[PDB]
Symmetry: C2
Subunit: 122 residues, 2 copies
């Protein structure tokens, strides 16, 4: 069983919060979900370094989610980003452009299929 790191925006809306709960609930089927400002950073970074997969919900813009993704890239982690185009947002070119289709994947999704996409990934 892999160690799984989930990230999402601390400022996510009602739709985002229900989706984060759904993503985390489904990730439990595959492995262990690991998830003072300095203390928060150090603890989250320790979890990120131990992760086998980093799964980020990137629909809401967030400095923290972007930061965890940049650190995860440099930690050589396998990354899956999930973006909901029905939010009307445009995903940052830095995240869409980070994708290489293998160790860094960015998938658009409709809210109803998020568990089926996670099953496909694992």
């Amino acid at each position: 069983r892999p160690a799984l790191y989930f990230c999402g925006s601390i400022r996510g809306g009602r739709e985002d919060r229900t989706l984060y709960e759904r993503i985390v609930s489904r990730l439990r089927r595959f492995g262990t979900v690991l998830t003072g400002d300095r203390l928060i950073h150090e603890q989250d970074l320790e979890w990120l370094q131990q992760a086998d997969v980093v799964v980020a919900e990137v629909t809401q813009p967030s400095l923290g989610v972007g930061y965890e993704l940049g650190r995860a890239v440099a930690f050589n982690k396998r990354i899956l980003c999930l973006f909901r185009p029905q939010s009307g947002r445009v995903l940052s070119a830095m995240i869409r452009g980070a994708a290489d289709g293998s160790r860094f994947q960015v998938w658009d999704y409709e809210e109803g299929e998020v568990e089926a996409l996670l099953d496909r990934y694992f």
Copy 2:
């Protein structure tokens, strides 16, 4: 000259056009601002549009001696750049405006170690004076 990299949110770009312009103009006093212009033959020498932007931005980031980030507007792109910059062992300065009413992400505020990664709350009027102090 020291190679300086400046980043800010793309979505704030029109509203914050003048503020990012003031930071960049003051950074010019202390080094070459790598991020001010993109040479087209460099992009041609290098992929879809987003990938091209990611690659050019990562080339600027690795060339940098100092990374200056305006972190007032939440952005996945700016956070990603800061994450990659930390791992490249870059000296980083983040500038945040508490007058915006926002709470800066604990991941950015908590990343500060006092020397190679600094986060400074500022009022817009002192931004040039703050850049002078950092670069002295």
